[PDB]
Amino acid sequence: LDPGLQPGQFSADEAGAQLFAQSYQSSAEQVLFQSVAASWAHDTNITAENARRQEEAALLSQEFAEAWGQKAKELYEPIWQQFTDPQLRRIIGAVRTLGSANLPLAKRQQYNALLSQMSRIYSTAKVCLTCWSLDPDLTNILASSRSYAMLLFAWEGWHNAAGIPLKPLYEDFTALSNEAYKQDGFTDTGAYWRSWYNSPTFEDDLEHLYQQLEPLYLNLHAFVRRALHRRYGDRYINLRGPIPAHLLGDMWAQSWENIYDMVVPFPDKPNLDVTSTMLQQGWQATHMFRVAEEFFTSLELSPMPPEFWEGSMLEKPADGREVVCHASAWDFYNRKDFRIKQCTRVTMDQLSTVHHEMGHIQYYLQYKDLPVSLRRGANPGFHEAIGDVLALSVSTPEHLHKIGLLDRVTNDTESDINYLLKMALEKIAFLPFGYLVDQWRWGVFSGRTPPSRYNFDWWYLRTKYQGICPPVTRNETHFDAGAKFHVPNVTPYIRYFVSFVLQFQFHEALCKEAGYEGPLHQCDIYRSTKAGAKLRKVLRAGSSRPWQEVLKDMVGLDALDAQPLLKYFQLVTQWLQEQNQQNGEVLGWPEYQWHPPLPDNYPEGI
Numbered sequence: 009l010d011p012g013l014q015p016g017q018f019s020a021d022e023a024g025a026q027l028f029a030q031s032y033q034s035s036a037e038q039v040l041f042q043s044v045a046a047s048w049a050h051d052t053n054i055t056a057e058n059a060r061r062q063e064e065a066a067l068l069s070q071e072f073a074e075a076w077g078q079k080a081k082e083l084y085e086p087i088w089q090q091f092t093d094p095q096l097r098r099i100i101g102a103v104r105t106l107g108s109a110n111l112p113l114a115k116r117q118q119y120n121a122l123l124s125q126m127s128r129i130y131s132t133a134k135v136c137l138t139c140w141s142l143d144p145d146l147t148n149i150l151a152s153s154r155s156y157a158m159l160l161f162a163w164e165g166w167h168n169a170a171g172i173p174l175k176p177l178y179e180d181f182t183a184l185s186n187e188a189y190k191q192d193g194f195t196d197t198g199a200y201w202r203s204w205y206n207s208p209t210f211e212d213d214l215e216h217l218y219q220q221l222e223p224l225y226l227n228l229h230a231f232v233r234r235a236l237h238r239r240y241g242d243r244y245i246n247l248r249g250p251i252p253a254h255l256l257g258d259m260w261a262q263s264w265e266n267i268y269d270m271v272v273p274f275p276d277k278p279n280l281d282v283t284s285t286m287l288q289q290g291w292q293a294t295h296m297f298r299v300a301e302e303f304f305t306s307l308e309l310s311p312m313p314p315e316f317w318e319g320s321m322l323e324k325p326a327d328g329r330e331v332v333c334h335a336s337a338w339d340f341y342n343r344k345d346f347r348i349k350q351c352t353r354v355t356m357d358q359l360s361t362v363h364h365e366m367g368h369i370q371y372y373l374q375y376k377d378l379p380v381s382l383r384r385g386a387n388p389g390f391h392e393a394i395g396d397v398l399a400l401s402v403s404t405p406e407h408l409h410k411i412g413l414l415d416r417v418t419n420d421t422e423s424d425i426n427y428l429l430k431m432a433l434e435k436i437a438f439l440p441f442g443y444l445v446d447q448w449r450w451g452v453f454s455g456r457t458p459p460s461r462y463n464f465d466w467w468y469l470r471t472k473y474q475g476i477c478p479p480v481t482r483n484e485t486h487f488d489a490g491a492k493f494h495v496p497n498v499t500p501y502i503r504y505f506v507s508f509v510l511q512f513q514f515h516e517a518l519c520k521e522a523g524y525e526g527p528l529h530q531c532d533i534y535r536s537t538k539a540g541a542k543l544r545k546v547l548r549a550g551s552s553r554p555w556q557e558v559l560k561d562m563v564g565l566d567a568l569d570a571q572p573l574l575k576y577f578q579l580v581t582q583w584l585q586e587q588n589q590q591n592g593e594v595l596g597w598p599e600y601q602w603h604p605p606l607p608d609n610y611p612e613g614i
């Protein structure tokens with residue numbers, strides 16, 4: 009560790025802890041920048057040399073974290089919890105969490121190499137027939153193809169190509185991660201991840217939320233299953249069993265927006281999937297980001313700085329260079345460089361992804377002047393909700409008309425059901441998946457799910473919550489959890505379940521602040537500087553204050569609450585209930601053992 013980055017001496021009191029955090033801040037930004045920069049160089053250009061530089065940068069970050077983390081303990085272990093400054097407590101509490109820096113050098117290098125290799129495997133995996141990449145090739149097949157056998161080839165090809173080689177690495181990562189955080193006092197890594205929500209009843213609170221939401225999913229599921237049955241037939245769709253996991257428009261069946269055309273209740277109304285209009289009009293990635301930016305500035309939030317436009321990767325490179333295509337938003341911790349890395353495609357759902365990622369950036373811009381340790385969301389779910397809240401306004405037929413994507417504008421009950429059904433395919437359908445992913449990982453980290461049950465327990469949860477089944481037989485050689493980005497990239501997932509609930513609480517509060525007095529699902533906060541000011545207060549707080557208090561200041565309640573989401577979807581919740589009853593649907597999937605047969609000539613005819 010360079011001398012300038014090493015901790016000096018500070019008094020063993022709160023006045024020295026303050027000077028300690030100031031000196032930490034000075035060197036942490038440099039260490040974070042070199043680490044983020046090296047990660048950027050690798051993720052925008054996957055080479056072996058760039059992976060080596062990233063592992064060396066990660067090793068330096070661990071060296072920094074060890075020195076300052078061990079100094080923080082040395083000086084402040086028994087007095088930091090009593091400091092009068094609540095932000096200083098949060099800073100000290102963060103610095104003294106060493107994580108992977110607890111591992112001995114050899115195991116630090118193992119750990120860093122595992123993260124690098126898992127990242128490379130996921131983002132370079134391909135399905136060969138010439139070969140297809142996940143983004144865009146297989147993504148487009150899952151989204152547009154309606155051939156049961158073709159969707160099967162892409163689904164099976166991807167899960168096999170990405171998951172199988174990851175499993176031995178993921179086992180090793182899990183053990184090292186647990187070893188590291190056990191030295192921080194946590195029973196396992198999952199316990200550390202859950203501690204970010206500072207709620208002793210976190211898992212019970214989540215279970216109570218899902219109990220309120222599950223009936224909406226069950227009715228959406230039964231309605232969609234009927235629509236798929238009408239297209240694929242009784243051989244491939246069981247009206248009393250789980251839906252084959254490759255037929256819902258998305259590689260992970262986590263968003264069903266892509267099958268909207270098969271489920272739209274009233275096709276004679278305006279087409280709310282504006283993808284075809286974006287293409288007809290010649291939209292490109294840069295247009296999508298500028299339209300997103302202008303919504304932010306309409307609220308008097310910040311535009312994207314020049315450093316963002318000059319540094320970001322907004323399309324997949326056409327030099328064929330290997331990149332991490334999964335969309336992400338980057339804080340370089342130098343208060344100047346902020347970037348998005350996205351292999352953007354011209355679709356409506358990608359426009360929503362752009363808003364999601366730009367919401368991450370807006371957070372970074374608003375709290376860039378806080379101490380590095382507090383440059384986070386009030387909790388991780390806050391960070392995930394910002395852009396989605398704006399996208400809720402953008403997707404309204406009224407707003408789409410304003411930006412030229414929906415010429416016809418209608419306000420009738422049928423159009424409302426169409427819109428709420430489309431929104432349910434994006435938001436309700438995701439809820440079981442957003443909930444189950446970290447249930448699986450918490451069980452892996454705790455040891456309830458050993459490697460011998462990785463896939464068994466994954467598909468138990470997928471069926472239990474999503475009511476889907478794999479369309480080909482799986483076994484424990486397969487590692488289908490590993491075929492989902494966040495698992496090999498070690499990104500927690502419960503934040504997305506939290507965000508999908510939270511964003512409707514935000515939406516309701518900002519709509520009220522904007523002076524809107526109509527149906528919640530028709531609210532558009534576009535150009536509301538009052539709504540912008542309320543949102544800005546959240547963003548500028550970072551993690552400096554307990555999220556429960558930040559939430560109460562914003563929405564008037566100190567807890568996650570499903571009522572705004574239920575209120576938003578009320579009309580289609582009632583409509584789906586009635587339709588499924590009239591159609592004599594079985595809610596749920598009582599034939600839980602059912603899997604579809606293989607196509608006659610599979611995979612010969614692809």
Ligand SMILES: *[C@@H]1O[C@H](CO[C@@H]2O[C@@H](C)[C@@H](O)[C@@H](O)[C@@H]2O)[C@@H](O[C@@H]2O[C@H](CO)[C@@H](O[C@@H]3O[C@H](CO)[C@@H](O)[C@H](O)[C@@H]3O)[C@H](O)[C@H]2NC(C)=O)[C@H](O)[C@H]1NC(C)=O
Nearest residue numbers: 404405406407418419420524525526527528529530531532
């Ligand atoms: C789409 O249309 C709905 C429904 O409009 C209402 O019902 C129709 C059958 C007609 O009779 C309309 O004349 C009638 O407004 C609109 O929702 C309605 O918006 C108005 C405000 O624009 C709401 O009235 C306000 O209500 C608050 C109390 O909540 C009062 O303080 C105000 O003084 C004002 O009266 C009305 O409650 C609301 N109705 C519902 C069911 O929410 C909606 O605005 C419209 N949307 C678009 C995008 O055009």
Ligand SMILES: Cc1ccc([C@H]2CC[C@@H](C(=O)O)N2C(=O)CN[C@@H](CCc2ccccc2)C(=O)O)cc1
Nearest residue numbers: 334335336337357358360361364365392497499504
């Ligand atoms: C339209 C739309 C909106 C939002 C998403 C979000 C929610 C679902 C989840 C998913 O698609 O499963 N999702 C992402 O994954 C996005 N991308 C990660 C990247 C997080 C990351 C952290 C650290 C390092 C690298 C990446 C991020 O922005 O939160 C999807 C689609």
Ligand SMILES: *[C@@H]1O[C@H](CO)[C@@H](O[C@@H]2O[C@H](CO)[C@@H](O)[C@H](O)[C@H]2NC(C)=O)[C@H](O)[C@H]1NC(C)=O
Nearest residue numbers: 049050052053054055056057058059325327329
């Ligand atoms: C991808 O990364 C490699 C580094 O691993 C880059 O290769 C360097 O390119 C510069 C030219 O600007 C040369 O001077 C270096 O000698 C190269 N280094 C190595 C190890 O080959 C490459 O330029 C990157 N590609 C892009 C498009 O940025």
Ligand SMILES: *[C@@H]1O[C@H](CO[C@@H]2O[C@@H](C)[C@@H](O)[C@@H](O)[C@@H]2O)[C@@H](O)[C@H](O)[C@H]1NC(C)=O
Nearest residue numbers: 164168172480481482483484485486606610
């Ligand atoms: C696991 O699965 C591997 C390949 O998948 C198999 O392919 C088709 C033909 C069916 O046999 C299906 O049931 C299988 O999933 C096999 O190579 C492997 O031997 C299977 N079992 C084990 C223990 O690895």
Ligand SMILES: [Cl-]
Nearest residue numbers: 388500502503
């Ligand atoms: Cl999280």
Ligand SMILES: [Mg+2]
Nearest residue numbers: 265266355357
């Ligand atoms: Mg789509």
Ligand SMILES: [Zn+2]
Nearest residue numbers: 364368391392
């Ligand atoms: Zn996000």
